[model samples]
Target: SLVLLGRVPAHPDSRCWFLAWNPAGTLLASCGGDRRIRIWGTEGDSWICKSVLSEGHQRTVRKVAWSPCGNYLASASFDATTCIWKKNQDFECVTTLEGHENEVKSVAWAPSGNLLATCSRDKSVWVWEVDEEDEYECVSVLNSHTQDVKHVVWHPSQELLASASYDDTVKLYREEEDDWVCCATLEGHESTVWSLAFDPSGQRLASCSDDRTVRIWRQYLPGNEQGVACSPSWKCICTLSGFHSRTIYDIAWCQLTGALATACGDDAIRVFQEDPNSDPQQPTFSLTAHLHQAHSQDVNCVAWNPKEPGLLASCSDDGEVAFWKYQR
Candidate 1:
């Protein structure tokens, strides 16, 4: 079951798009149709707005990412730019990397905190290299996907990055002798793959698609006896079909509790738990909680606190952000 701890008009008169937590779990960053980024933190026991960012972008801010060290924040926008904001005694726009042809959908930082990745509606994925000096240089421009790249998430355990595309596939990229190249393409979804999340241990990955389902992929090293391949590969291990009645937008794997959470277009929120005694080769997961009418409109995003177990945050097309407490 879940309890709504609090709710706020995050975007006020506009739509709320995404929610992200800082590495310390001390701050929450949100983007919206208002073309601003709002940072929230606890005021005693309730979430209170601490700062609102403008002048970072001229268009809608699609997504915001916090560096692994909590020292910087990145925002992707419809302005076809990604802005790097510094976090110290104050929040300030430090750099703007503009090259994408259209709307920049998502931005993410590598677990090492030195690399950043951004995807765009232009159908290309770009990786940006950053330093303490705030100088961001494009290191690779991946023109592999045929359609818009909806999201890009880096697998922290390695020098790997995975991207979800409107072409109904997921591509994994890694550093090679020459440069970054797609190592494997995981194709199974019948529609556009909207988002991707890796488990806390980075052993498995979860992807949601416009096809209205979630798929789990398991990683296999180059020499696993289960398959015949020289390069490391990931294969679909499980498919969660018919679980969501409509399109699924975002999914999050709780790092502290190992619980899986999903945001849906059906105006609902669901949480699932893996069976501890299930077979390793073919693991099992079951929905543990559901809020059929979690919001009045489509729930666009869900995120679990990096430090606080069971503390989940969600935003919706309804223009509000809600905090929920999940109890097993």
Candidate 2:
């Protein structure tokens, strides 16, 4: 049964734009118009304000990602900066990263747990690494996209990274000769790509875009060795479209069951999964869940709980955060 746990009147001057859950699954952090991060925790099904993490970002908070180790959080703001916050009795912004001349749209933690990646409208990707004392420092900058880089995600198992841009390209990077480099470029989407994620196995990447389509990228071949010969060319293996007549803003893959969920501008949330049996020439994505009343406005972000299988979260331009789940 679903319950209206609670809702905080966020910065009345600014709307809530982003939300993230802590690793312990007990806290929720949200940010928006006022450039402040609000931490909320549930107490007996009642969501209560626990703390305020960071403030005065000077722009809208576009995205927030929690570190896998549960000690830190990263936030991207429209002011063109990404801030890293460490957990204490009271949360505080320990590091502020700046360099992107354009709005920072997204930031992601690499699977290694020591590094982070961020992309912005400046057509660049920046990687950050933490020192022994948990201090974050920008390590590398890869400018591969010809247009605004909207999202950057690290390969789940390797140092390889991918970035989606408004130039209709998905740039993949791999570290070579101790230098992080863009090794592959995926060119297929005709509209601005917004979000992307890797499958649990890290062999496949999923992306969604304003083009109203979902795309999958897999290595022409698969392996973990440093120089894997094959070009990192990505093809539109399967496109799940024609259902919603609006721009798709976000996509998340459920690692436990290979399910794909998309949040769109049409106020609709569509969930997809592969058929156990399908044709090789024509693979298929079957719609498994549809939330017709998911949001009152354009849905901008949607994420599957990293620790909880089948649980999902979404935020919208209308200032609402939605949590969803499904049964086996």
Candidate 3:
């Protein structure tokens, strides 16, 4: 059973574009069409907005991510810049990274917290190096996508990076020598790939798309062979179709419970659990729970708490954010 804890009026004026939970799971950061970022924390038994972060971007703030250390926050905006904020007594803007031609759709921090990545409508993903003094320098500009790059995310504990694009493909990148290079390109989605998440073990990746399908991709390893010295190969292990009525905007795999969740354009929130007795070569995922009308409008994003099992957070085009607890 999935219990809806409650809903918060997150972005009253416009759609809530995204939601991100800090590494410690003590705070949740959300951005929206209001061109603002809101950080929320628990008070007693309810989630409350702890602080409002605004005036940092001139346009809609598209996405926000917390660094692995949880000491800083990064926000990507349609204003063509990403703002870095230090989590001091209050969130303070430390630096602004510019160079994107237009809207920066998403921002992600490397697992080590030493690098940051941003994707934009310019059809490029830029990797930046972070310094102790809060300075950022563009180290690599990957222009492999022919259309807008919607999202960029780093592997859990590796330097490996991945990006989703409107061109209907997912690309994997790795650092080589002094520059980052595309190590693999995943193609199969019939339309734009909106978001991606890797399983806890990092052995598999789940992607949701405008094609109204969620696909599971697993790293291909030859028998008795190991390591990705050159490049790696991936094959679609399973394709989940006919589950979503419209575009699936975001997907999250619970690192703690191995549950897969999705936010859909149809205003539904659904979760699936894999069958434990199924074969790895031919795995099956069963729909465990879902909310038919989770929000009044499009569900934009879903995120599972990194440090807490079954705790989930989601935002919507209805200007609301909802929290849920999964009971197995």
Candidate 4:
């Protein structure tokens, strides 16, 4: 169950598009149609706005992500650019990446903090390499998807990256000889795949789509040491269908507690717990909690505090952000 702790106006007079928790779990970043990014931090017993980042993008800020080291932040916007910010004593824009044709939809940092991934409505995903001097260079341009790429995420500890697209498939990428290539494609979603998240162990991936379902994919490796012609493959292990009343927008897998939370188009927030006693090969998960009307409008995103056990945060089209404490 989730106990509502507080609700605050995150993006006044506009829809809140995304929410992300810092790696240290000490800060929350929310971006919105107002073309601003608001950073929230806790003070004693209440969460308050600590800083506002503006003037980096000209249009709606679609997404925000924190680096693995928690020293930098990235904001993707409809202005066809991604803004990189340094978090020392103040939030300062350090660089601007501007190669996408239009509408940079999502931006994500690799686990090693050396690579950043961004996707666009131009039907491409770009891989950028970050140097020690905070300079970014475009390394690879992936155009495997025929439609807009909606989201991109990296494996927990590996350089492997996965992207979801409006083409109804998810593509996996890996680095090879200083270049990145699409290694695999997982296809099963009936409609546009909106968001993707890797499980805590990085062994499996979970994806939600406008098809109103969530699917789990696991990588399978054949035990052939003397590889004549062997390659790892991905397969859909589970499909959580008919659980959402409307399109599922975002899904978050808690790294601290192994809980899965989702924000839906029906303005609801739901969490699912995997059965620990069940067989790993054919695992089962059940809906543990649901908050109907979690927001007055569509719930756009949900993020779990990386260092907190049961803390979760969500943003909505209603322009508000809500914090929750989940209790088993």
Candidate 2 lDDT over 1-328, as tens digits, reads 2222234554454456766777666777777767778777666755677888656488888788888777788889999999888888767888888888889988888767888998888888998887788777778898867888888777756877788899987888877887788877887787999888787767778888888888887665655343345645455567776776899888878666677888888888788877869963346777887777677777776666666777666767766666666553
Cα lDDT listed for each candidate: 0.90, 0.76, 0.93, 0.93
**Model 1, residue pairs in steric clash:** none
- Write down the TM-score for model 4: 0.97
Tens-place lDDT per residue, model 4, 1-328, is: 9999999999988999999999899999999999999999999888999999988999999999999999899999999999999998769998999899989999999999999999999999999999978899999999999999999999999999999999999999999987898988999999999999999878889999999999998887676333323366787878888899999999999987889999999999999988999776667899998999999999999999999888999999989999999886
User: Each candidate: RMSD to true structure?
Assistant: 1.1, 3.3, 1.8, 1.9
- For model 3, residues 57-117, the per-residue Cα lDDT tens digits are 9999999999999999999999999999999877998899999998999999999999999
TM-score (all chains, Cα) for each model: 0.98, 0.89, 0.97, 0.97
Q: Which segments of model 2 are wrong by more than 4 Å?
A: 1-14, 222-233, 279-282
Q: Ten-residue segment with the worst summed lDDT in candidate 2?
A: 1-10
Residue 161 of model 3 has an lDDT of 92
Off by over 4 Å in 4: 224-230
The list of candidate 3 runs beyond 4 A from truth reads 221-231
Instruction: Tell me the RMSD of model 4 versus the true structure.
Output: 1.9
Residue 44's lDDT within candidate 4 is: 81
